[PDB]
Amino acid sequence: ARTSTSEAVVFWVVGTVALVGAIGVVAARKAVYSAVFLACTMISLAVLYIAQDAPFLGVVQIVVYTGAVMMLFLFVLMLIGVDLTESLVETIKGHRIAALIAGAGFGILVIAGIGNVSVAGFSGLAAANSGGNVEGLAALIFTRYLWAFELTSALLITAALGAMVLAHRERFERRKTQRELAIERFQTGGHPTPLPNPGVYARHNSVDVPARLPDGSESPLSVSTILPHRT
Amino acid sequence: TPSIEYGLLSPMLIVFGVAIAGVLIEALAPRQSRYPLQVTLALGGLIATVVAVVFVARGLSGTPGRPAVLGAVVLDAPAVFLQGTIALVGILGIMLIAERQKATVSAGEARGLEDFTPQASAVAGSVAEQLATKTGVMQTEVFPLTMFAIGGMLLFPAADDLLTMFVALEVLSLPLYLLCGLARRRRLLSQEAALKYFLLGAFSSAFFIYGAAMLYGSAGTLDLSGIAESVAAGSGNTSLALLGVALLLVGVLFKVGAVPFHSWIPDVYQGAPTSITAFMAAATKIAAFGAMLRIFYVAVPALRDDWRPVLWAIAILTMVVGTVTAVTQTDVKRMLAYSAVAHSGFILTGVIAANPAGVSSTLFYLFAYGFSTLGAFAVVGLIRNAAGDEETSMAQWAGLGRRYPIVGVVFSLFLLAFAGIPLTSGFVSKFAVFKAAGEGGAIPLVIIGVIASAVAAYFYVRVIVLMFFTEPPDDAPELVVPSGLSTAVVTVTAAVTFALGALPQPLLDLANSAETFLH
Amino acid sequence: MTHPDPTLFGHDPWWLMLAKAVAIFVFLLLTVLSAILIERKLLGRMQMRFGPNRVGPAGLLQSLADGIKLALKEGLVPAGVDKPIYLLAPVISVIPAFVAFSVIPLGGAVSVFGHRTPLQLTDLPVAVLFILAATSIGVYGIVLAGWASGSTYPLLGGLRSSAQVVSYEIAMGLSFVAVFLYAGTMSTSGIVAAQDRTWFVFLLLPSFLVYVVSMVGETNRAPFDLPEAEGELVGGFHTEYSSLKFAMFMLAEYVNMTTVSALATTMFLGGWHAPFPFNLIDGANSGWWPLLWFTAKVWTFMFLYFWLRATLPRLRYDQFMALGWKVLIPVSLLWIMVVAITRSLRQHGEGTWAAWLLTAAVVVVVALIWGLATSLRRRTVQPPPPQSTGAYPVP
Amino acid sequence: MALYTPILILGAIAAVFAVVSVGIALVIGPRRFNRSKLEAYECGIDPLPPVAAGLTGQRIPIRYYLIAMLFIVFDIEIVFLYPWAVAFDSLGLFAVIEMLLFMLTVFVAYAYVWRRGGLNWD
Amino acid sequence: MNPDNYLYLSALLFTIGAAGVLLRRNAIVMFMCVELMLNAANLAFVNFSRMHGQLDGQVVAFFTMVVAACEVVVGLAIIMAIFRTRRSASVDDANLLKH
């Protein structure tokens, strides 16, 4: 079985992009780079689906995985870091070599098991897509697989319940409102009103710089405690 | 229009509807009334499920099973047997889950005797967690999630298509991933357990779906019956079929805990809530082995000569590594988890039998062992350190039986059932599986499992030694009731574990009647 | 019958389809320039100004002048930026913007150089969802432009863009559902054909409104405008960008505006079909007139964009997300069920029940949305107690 | 490949135009190296010492992370409607009831999220 | 081009995804790798559906997409909890349960 030459070129370029994206996801020292590579891989796979007579599947891939990878990027910023460069140095002794060997062996064995399959006949999907690909998918989903379709609702409910139970902080940890924070005794107010501004010196006016007290010493309140005292 | 057999789906439909109703209770019910409703909604629901099962079972006294949803679900005798077992185990597990704090001056008992932190999102030991504990708040979302687990688990044996069975695997896995991280005490360990279980389960499920893809490619069909027809007729590729069988076997073996995939079970069982750990160790094993039985006795019997050896290498390992590792263990929960690995190996020996005796023996083994495991973990949940944390350290159990002879005797009964001593359901169970294996030409597995059981008897017996033959330490732990539900669970479980040992022919006739799948 | 029509699509010779692609690209370019200029001028009129009046005859060259100026201006590459992604983000924003327009029906079949071809670059079985996919890819341009800039304000702009997506994308997805129900196809040509009897704006008004709100959100336009938010984030994501990179961000914004306006025209305003005052004319829906009608409707949507920008302040992105998830998503999800039940009932002859259910559902929705806007967002508040500092006696 | 090669041609035109536009930005117009020009924009103030960058702003919390998670599941779930919608006429009443049940389940999840404050932070 | 290439690509992607789960400590990167694995399975399903001239494989790929989304959300919730308690998203940090 041989596909169209144009389809062959599409596969080669797009699958090269997808493979590079997967390799980047695995190897990108920056987490945001890994998310971008994941987006590239998902879009490449969507294009391949489109090439394989699965238009709806490819387009849905693009949409949903665009959204999902954007959320993953948000969580990378929230939990890992904006531009944190991971070391990727093997922390478990000998684990890197063993993992590489195991992955290579598994991939080799999987490919060997696959062998040549399309040689045994490759039916054109045009017969099934006749009458609309989305219509055929709908006929299958809501007749042959309606049970799995319904259970996907249970999957969604479990996901929502997990997110609420594990991630939704309750009343006891609700951040104080500006209204609430504006009344404490006298909120900021009486307490160093607005805290003193960071010092403004010639050659130095960043927020890191500390203001100068009359005695010439740096004012501790002038610079936020989170910053490392410098500049 | 597609004919839908609501009667056949009745237990599954009841469980899922009850889960959805519990979510509705979480949504629009007042806090003070959420727990009374949920448990009332949950237990009753499961009871209904059990009733449904027997009705379906009676309905199955005629046709040898029948598909329900145009394939994709088949309720035959093995399916209904496993569904009833899972329903009973779920009833017991939910009764364990619903246990609240024994008693306190404040009315803020917060479903804590069941190890569930009042606010999972709250940081461990933070002022928010302390305030939530004081106020007596409880995250009743546990009951919906648990039901969903049971839902998916009830489906997993009955799934007659690769897609449906994958969906069931995910549906039962996600709620368990979440539940592993809700422990009231030792929250760090519970969260680590949840993360490990999620990572390894997602990894295994990726393998499972890839294997399903390979089988679909080889056979061009997702129904197990269709795959069997294709492989038997030789129409398939016969290399993709084997590769898919291997990859799908990876997922199911992870779910049951074979040695190449066991490592998650010790950590997860140690870290997860004791009630959740018990319900998991029983019912998830039951469901996973039901699916494995369906795969091997329905989907791909024809390739027995191809996958029979692989399972051997696993079963042997599962019996050896599972047991030998438990020998040196010093933690009761961890020791029981390794025991669960070993008993997964013992089940796999019966599955390897590839004969109807194998199916019957596996079904009985799963029933009896699920009950024994649930009871053992429920008992473990009651041994409380002075600080209130479960005194899982085995050394601290010294003289526990002497202080609490009734609970000690019950736990010794469970331990001997696991060891497979006669007059306990465990021995009848092991004998069934090993007899099935022997009839199947796998008597070397009978010998190896015999040696493995001899080894495992040591670490099952050391617990009894500490419990009875040793004088209690100065800081020995103390029992916490904590309520009628937990005592009822323990007593029912012990009674079943003893009756199925003394008088096993009941439920063994049932297992025999369910030795045939709807091929 | 089957859309896209096989006898009309896929038969274009290489030269003809290349010519149509070039024509569509040039049309988008001219429409972006026209939008830039016509906005400025209409905003001026709405503010009783003139807008650009001097650069070229009647200020017609103002937009092209600005584009060339951005070309002639220094191309900055700030230190501390993620140079690869920083340079790619404009391209990631632009390319999908243009690609999405490929499946927009500008007109019906027309004969050019002896070939009968549709007056649109192409059509797909999933054309509408393809437009959605392309627009979704486009937002990564904004997000990565904000992130890669390596500065606080661009980073906040990118985060606001991600929140934008979370707010509006599900709303658009659900809004498409009623259109698909009534048209029975996701191809844009099929939807236009289905709108032949009556435009879906009348039949699917709730879906139309939800989609309108959600596309105004999608294009990062006022009153949402969150990723840029000049008054809050200086330049938002496109801070640290200059010259044609900033120009391409703005070009992507305007091309997305055109794409969503054209898609609204396709689904709800009967696509290129002639409006009622001209619908009676023979041949109005034939020849090249459909191009005129489609342009007119797209530009009415552009006028709506400019009107919203002139009139409304910009929301807080948390408020926009609350709108999207507490109003848009619920409303669209309920409307899908209502439409499905109504269509099923009328298909089964229960027309009276269908009409009653539709009217009752819309009444209930407009009551509950009003409650949310006024009751949940209560116009009442509590008093305050005194503290250490002595306080005067209140009236 | 038909029905797509026009999309490919338009995408090629757009990609060429965009990359050429970036190149024009870089190579057209004056270029003048200036340390102050290249450093980050901070409303005119000197940028915080990048040497000490790894102490603040390393991680940016999002107050709508819960909505962000729910977005993934809801977006992947609603896509079931499109094949249902397009084939609505061909399917019949049973499929309408199936989808109504599915949407009611989605509504239960959504209502649980909403009424328990899952949509409040941002 | 022989269609089997599509399968080989999947075998690579899945393999790569597996390797990622073994090599990357970040939990988010692990979720990305799991998504890679599931989408490799989807690619295999699509190729097989094309080979067999039926859409069942595409439906399975869609359901796998749903499963991947739900699993990612659950993992995200778990990692949020672990991060709030531990201030880190490294899987290697969750190492208490051992031996």
TrEMBL record, chain A:
List the signal peptide residues. Answer: none
The UniProt entry's GO CC annotations, sorted and at most eight, read: plasma membrane
Q: Where in the cell is it found?
A: Cell membrane
**GO MF annotation, one:** NADH dehydrogenase (ubiquinone) activity
The protein's predominant localisation is membrane
Residue spans crossing the bilayer: 8-27, 32-50, 62-85, 97-125, 145-167
The UniProt keywords, alphabetically, are:
Cell membrane, Membrane, NAD, Quinone, Transmembrane, Transmembrane helix
Q: Sorted alphabetically, which InterPro entries does this protein's record hold?
A: NADH_UbQ/plastoQ_OxRdtase_su6 (IPR001457), Nuo/plastoQ_OxRdtase_6_NuoJ (IPR042106)
Q: Which reaction does it catalyse?
A: a quinone + NADH + 5 H(+)(in) = a quinol + NAD(+) + 4 H(+)(out)
**What Pfam family is a match for this entry?**
Oxidored_q3
**How is the protein disposed in the membrane?**
Multi-pass membrane protein
EC assignment:
7.1.1.-
The answer, when asked if Transmembrane helix is one of the entry's keywords, is yes
Which family does the record assign? Belongs to the complex I subunit 6 family.
The role this protein plays is: NDH-1 shuttles electrons from NADH, via FMN and iron-sulfur (Fe-S) centers, to quinones in the respiratory chain. Couples the redox reaction to proton translocation (for every two electrons transferred, four hydrogen ions are translocated across the cytoplasmic membrane), and thus conserves the redox energy in a proton gradient.
Q: What is the official name of this protein in its record? A: NADH-quinone oxidoreductase subunit J
Q: Species name for this entry?
A: Mycolicibacterium smegmatis (strain ATCC 700084 / mc(2)155) (Mycobacterium smegmatis)
Automatic annotation (TrEMBL), chain B:
- What are its E.C. numbers? 7.1.1.-
Record Pfam families: Proton_antipo_M
Q: Which reaction is recorded as catalysed by this protein?
A: a quinone + NADH + 5 H(+)(in) = a quinol + NAD(+) + 4 H(+)(out)
Q: What is this protein called?
A: NADH-quinone oxidoreductase subunit N
Its membrane topology is listed as: Multi-pass membrane protein
What is its quaternary makeup?
Answer: NDH-1 is composed of 14 different subunits. Subunits NuoA, H, J, K, L, M, N constitute the membrane sector of the complex.
Transmembrane residue ranges: 10-29, 41-60, 80-98, 142-159, 165-183, 195-219, 239-264, 276-297, 309-328, 335-357, 363-383, 404-423, 443-469, 481-503
Q: What organism is this sequence from? A: Mycolicibacterium smegmatis (strain ATCC 700084 / mc(2)155) (Mycobacterium smegmatis)
Annotated GO CC locations: endomembrane system; plasma membrane
* Reported function: NDH-1 shuttles electrons from NADH, via FMN and iron-sulfur (Fe-S) centers, to quinones in the respiratory chain. The immediate electron acceptor for the enzyme in this species is believed to be a menaquinone. Couples the redox reaction to proton translocation (for every two electrons transferred, four hydrogen ions are translocated across the cytoplasmic membrane), and thus conserves the redox energy in a proton gradient.
Q: Which UniProt keywords apply?
A: Cell membrane, Membrane, NAD, Oxidoreductase, Quinone, Translocase, Transmembrane, Transmembrane helix, Transport
Q: Which GO terms describe its biological process?
A: ATP synthesis coupled electron transport
Question: Does Translocase appear among the keywords?
Answer: yes
InterPro entries, A to Z = NADH-Q_OxRdtase_suN/2, ND/Mrp_TM
Family from the record: Belongs to the complex I subunit 2 family.
Q: Where in the numbering of this chain does the NADH:quinone oxidoreductase/Mrp antiporter transmembrane domain appear? A: 159-454
Q: Please name the GO terms that the record assigns under molecular function.
A: NADH dehydrogenase (quinone) (non-electrogenic) activity; NADH dehydrogenase (ubiquinone) activity; quinone binding
The compartments listed are: Cell membrane; Endomembrane system; Membrane
Q: What class of enzyme is it?
A: translocase
TrEMBL record, chain D:
Q: Where are its TM segments located?
A: 6-28, 64-85, 91-113
Give the UniProt subcellular location, in the record's own words. Answer: Cell membrane; Membrane
The terms describing its cellular component in GO are:
NADH dehydrogenase complex; plasma membrane
Q: Where does it mainly reside? A: membrane
Membrane topology reported for the UniProt record: Multi-pass membrane protein
Keywords for this protein: Cell membrane, Membrane, NAD, Oxidoreductase, Quinone, Translocase, Transmembrane, Transmembrane helix, Transport
Question: What top-level branch of life does the organism fall under?
Answer: Bacteria
Reaction(s) catalyzed by this protein? a quinone + NADH + 5 H(+)(in) = a quinol + NAD(+) + 4 H(+)(out)
Tell whether Glycoprotein is among the UniProt keywords.
no
Q: What is its EC number?
A: 7.1.1.-
Q: Which GO terms describe its molecular function?
A: NADH dehydrogenase (quinone) (non-electrogenic) activity; NADH dehydrogenase (ubiquinone) activity; quinone binding
Q: What class of enzyme is it?
A: translocase
Function as written in the Swiss-Prot or TrEMBL entry: NDH-1 shuttles electrons from NADH, via FMN and iron-sulfur (Fe-S) centers, to quinones in the respiratory chain. The immediate electron acceptor for the enzyme in this species is believed to be a menaquinone. Couples the redox reaction to proton translocation (for every two electrons transferred, four hydrogen ions are translocated across the cytoplasmic membrane), and thus conserves the redox energy in a proton gradient.
Describe, as the record does, how this protein assembles with itself and its partners: NDH-1 is composed of 14 different subunits. Subunits NuoA, H, J, K, L, M, N constitute the membrane sector of the complex.
The family annotation for this protein states: Belongs to the complex I subunit 3 family.
Protein name, entry field = NADH-quinone oxidoreductase subunit A
Encoding gene (name): nuoA
